[PDB]
Amino acid sequence: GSAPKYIEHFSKFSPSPLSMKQFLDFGSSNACEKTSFTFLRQELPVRLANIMKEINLLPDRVLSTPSVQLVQSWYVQSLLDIMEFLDKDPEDHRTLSQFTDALVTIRNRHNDVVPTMAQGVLEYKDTYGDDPVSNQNIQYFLDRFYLSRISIRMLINQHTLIFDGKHIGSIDPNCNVSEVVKDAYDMAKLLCDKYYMASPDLEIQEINAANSKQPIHMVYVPSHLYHMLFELFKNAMRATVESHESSLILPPIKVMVALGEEDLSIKMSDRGGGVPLRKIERLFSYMYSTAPGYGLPISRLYAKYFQGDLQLFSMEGFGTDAVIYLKALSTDSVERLPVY
Amino acid sequence: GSAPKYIEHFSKFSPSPLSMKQFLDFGSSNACEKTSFTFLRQELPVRLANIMKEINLLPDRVLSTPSVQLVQSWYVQSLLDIMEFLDKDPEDHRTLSQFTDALVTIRNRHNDVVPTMAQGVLEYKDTYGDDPVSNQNIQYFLDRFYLSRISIRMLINQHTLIFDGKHIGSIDPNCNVSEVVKDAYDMAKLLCDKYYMASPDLEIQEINAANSKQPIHMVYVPSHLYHMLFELFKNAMRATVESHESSLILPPIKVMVALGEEDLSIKMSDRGGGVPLRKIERLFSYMYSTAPGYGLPISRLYAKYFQGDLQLFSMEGFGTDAVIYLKALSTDSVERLPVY
Numbered sequence: 001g002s003a004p005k006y007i008e009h010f011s012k013f014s015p016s017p018l019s020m021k022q023f024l025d026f027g028s029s030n031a032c033e034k035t036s037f038t039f040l041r042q043e044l045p046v047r048l049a050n051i052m053k054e055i056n057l058l059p060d061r062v063l064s065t066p067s068v069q070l071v072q073s074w075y076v077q078s079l080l081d082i083m084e085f086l087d088k089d090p091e092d093h094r095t096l097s098q099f100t101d102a103l104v105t106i107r108n109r110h111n112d113v114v115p116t117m118a119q120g121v122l123e124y125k126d127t128y129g130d131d132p133v134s135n136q137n138i139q140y141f142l143d144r145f146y147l148s149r150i151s152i153r154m155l156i157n158q159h160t161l162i163f164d165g166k167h168i169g170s171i172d173p174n175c176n177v178s179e180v181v182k183d184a185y186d187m188a189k190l191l192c193d194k195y196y197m198a199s200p201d202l203e204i205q206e207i208n209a210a211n212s213k214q215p216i217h218m219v220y221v222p223s224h225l226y227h228m229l230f231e232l233f234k235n236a237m238r239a240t241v242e243s244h245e246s247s248l249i250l251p252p253i254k255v256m257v258a259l260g261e262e263d264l265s266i267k268m269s270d271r272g273g274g275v276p277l278r279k280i281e282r283l284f285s286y287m288y289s290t291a292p293g294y295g296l297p298i299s300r301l302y303a304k305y306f307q308g309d310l311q312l313f314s315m316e317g318f319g320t321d322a323v324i325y326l327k328a329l330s331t332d333s334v335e336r337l338p339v340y
Numbered sequence: 341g342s343a344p345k346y347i348e349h350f351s352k353f354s355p356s357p358l359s360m361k362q363f364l365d366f367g368s369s370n371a372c373e374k375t376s377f378t379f380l381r382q383e384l385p386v387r388l389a390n391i392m393k394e395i396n397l398l399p400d401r402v403l404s405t406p407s408v409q410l411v412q413s414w415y416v417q418s419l420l421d422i423m424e425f426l427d428k429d430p431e432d433h434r435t436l437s438q439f440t441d442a443l444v445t446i447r448n449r450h451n452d453v454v455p456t457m458a459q460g461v462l463e464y465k466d467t468y469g470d471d472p473v474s475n476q477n478i479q480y481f482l483d484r485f486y487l488s489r490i491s492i493r494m495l496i497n498q499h500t501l502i503f504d505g506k507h508i509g510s511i512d513p514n515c516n517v518s519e520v521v522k523d524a525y526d527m528a529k530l531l532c533d534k535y536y537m538a539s540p541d542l543e544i545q546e547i548n549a550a551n552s553k554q555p556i557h558m559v560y561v562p563s564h565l566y567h568m569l570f571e572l573f574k575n576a577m578r579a580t581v582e583s584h585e586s587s588l589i590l591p592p593i594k595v596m597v598a599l600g601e602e603d604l605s606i607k608m609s610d611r612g613g614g615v616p617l618r619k620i621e622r623l624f625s626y627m628y629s630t631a632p633g634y635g636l637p638i639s640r641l642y643a644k645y646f647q648g649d650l651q652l653f654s655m656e657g658f659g660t661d662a663v664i665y666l667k668a669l670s671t672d673s674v675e676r677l678p679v680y
């Protein structure tokens with residue numbers, strides 16, 4: 001076929017990272033659908049081909065696995081589905097309506113990639129071992145693969161949500177961080193109450209440095225923020241409950257939302273007994289987090305996707321702090337795409 | 341001369357990292373002076389030669405500087421001073437008394453190496469620039485150089501202090517961490533009061549997980565702990581005072597000392613306005629911390645010297661947490677020497 005020819009071609013192009021502003025401009029009006037089509041029919045093959053080229057550069061012991069080949073088959077099909085529109089005409093509303101339908105299919109085709117790539121890590125550990133060099137190479141590849149996957153789904157979500165026929169697709173220009181915190185907590189609480197018959201309470205404190213007592217808002221993707229906060233709450237609650245099983249006091253989970261000139265930082269503090277430093281440094285490893293999971297490493301990728309970060313600092317015997325670092329300004333919020 | 345011949349010889353040996361137990365065994369009695377002499381007259385040339393060999397592997401633009409050559413001259417002289425005792429007899433008390441006197445001279449000869457190596461970094465920045473690749477290479481070398489320097493001074497201090505003619509040299513087998521915290525604070529307070537005419541107050545809280553309300557003790561080098569806590573207090577006070585100049589409230593500096601099964605963690609929390617993440621990641625860089633300083637990067641080396649760490653997590657607009665990670669058990673407290 002021509003799949004190898006198409007990967008090599010678009011592999012020569014570099015992905016074009018977009019800013020929050022550019023995302024808001026693309027979603028400003030439904031009339032923009034044409035510019036989004038002409039941009040995505042070139043950008044999506046470029047991002048797909050770039051990661052598809054790195055997949056083919058993996059060692060043959062990884063490249064010949066059924067998991068990598070299954071995912072590579074999805075990417076080849078997705079690439080070909082998008083390349084059909086390269087010659088079509090943007091002015092034909094059927095060309096655009098078909099593109100939107102083709103993106104939704106591509107998105108659903110890749111819905112089960114995270115657990116599939118997680119099966120590959122487990123297969124590797126049992127077929128070749130869990131050495132540190134394998135950890136760094138798996139970590140390096142998966143971080144870049146998943147980050148690419150986040151970027152592609154972001155592009156697809158922005159087009160399919162806005163051009164469907166206050167919120168700009170998946171972006172909330174006035175995202176109230178404390179409200180997303182509460183939502184993520186309420187969901188973790190429900191699960192914690194169902195499993196442990198007890199849940200820690202929530203305390204939130206905001207620190208708007210420049211405008212005290214003004215609610216902290218930002219331009220961000222609330223779904224991404226929810227995912228990070230939901231994973232952290234699940235860990236903080238699990239630790240808080242299991243560490244106080246022999247006690248009556250169930251210490252609360254405290255969340256500080258701080259807004260500075262550059263950073264919007266969200267710290268989650270628990271008293272769930274803490275974790276030795278030796279293990280904290282392994283909670284972000286795909287291989288060590290795999291067992292016969294990836295919430296934290298992927299959560300950190302969501303934070304990094306827009307020039308943020310996610311860091312953990314524990315105190316064995318007391319508790320653990322988790323901090324989501326985000327860019328406070330939409331001008332500094334730019335896609336972090338893997339460097340190919 | 342034979343200095344190049346001696347470096348190459350002892351460079352083939354690997355440094356022998358010692359544990360807290362081994363340090364306590366060497367200092368158990370003054371009678372041990374012979375075993376310490378026979379060990380140090382081989383180990384000190386090995387550690388000196390190993391770092392001296394890496395110095396000679398630096399690029400000629402760094403190796404030909406007056407700072408690197410001045411320090412290399414001190415190391416060559418120190419190496420030669422120690423090699424004089426290789427053939428001498430341990431049973432002669434004059435051979436031992438001369439060794440002790442020779443170690444003190446070597447220690448004082450290298451007293452001004454940190455500021456000298458800091459002058460070299462400044463010279464490099466102005467002669468060749470402050471690029472990221474230069475930062476990583478300078479960071480890599482200085483971290484290993486200073487860590488080696490800490491290890492050598494530790495060996496010398498343990499011999500000269502114990503074999504001078506409750507505390508085992510520089511090691512306190514029952515180091516009360518909160519007392520060292522108070523000492524470091526009281527010194528930073530004095531300086532802060534002298535310079536700013538105002539100082540934050542101190543609050544300490546201990547969390548002895550296994551034995552609640554029992555004071556937290558450990559086997560450690562209190563001088564090293566003081567240095568780390570003193571640097572952190574100076575930063576936390578500077579930020580706390582300068583960030584509240586237009587205010588009346590001067591928030592306190594809060595310190596938690598937590599003791600777990602594996603870690604003894606010390607967190608210093610201030611409300612000095614915080615620092616953007618972009619800059620926190622540069623506070624441990626020698627090059628970016630150099631200006632026409634190294635307290636934090638060296639403090640982290642002291643923490644790592646016995647398998648610990650020092651980490652900073654800030655929240656721009658609020659404050660900053662600094663955590664010293666130490667090993668709680670003397671069995672896990674082992675020298676971290678550079679890997680040559």
Ligand SMILES: O=C1Cc2ccccc2N1
Pocket residue numbers: 232233235236239270272273274275283312320322
């Ligand atoms: O004990 C723990 C481990 C952890 C990871 C992430 C968030 C909170 C916590 N608490």
Ligand SMILES: O=C1Cc2ccccc2N1
Pocket residue numbers: 572573575576579610612613614615623652660662
């Ligand atoms: O603002 C700051 C920066 C810093 C470094 C180390 C310790 C405390 C602080 N506070």
Ligand SMILES: [Cl-]
Pocket residue numbers: 110113149
């Ligand atoms: Cl995917």
Ligand SMILES: [Cl-]
Pocket residue numbers: 450453489
């Ligand atoms: Cl030195």
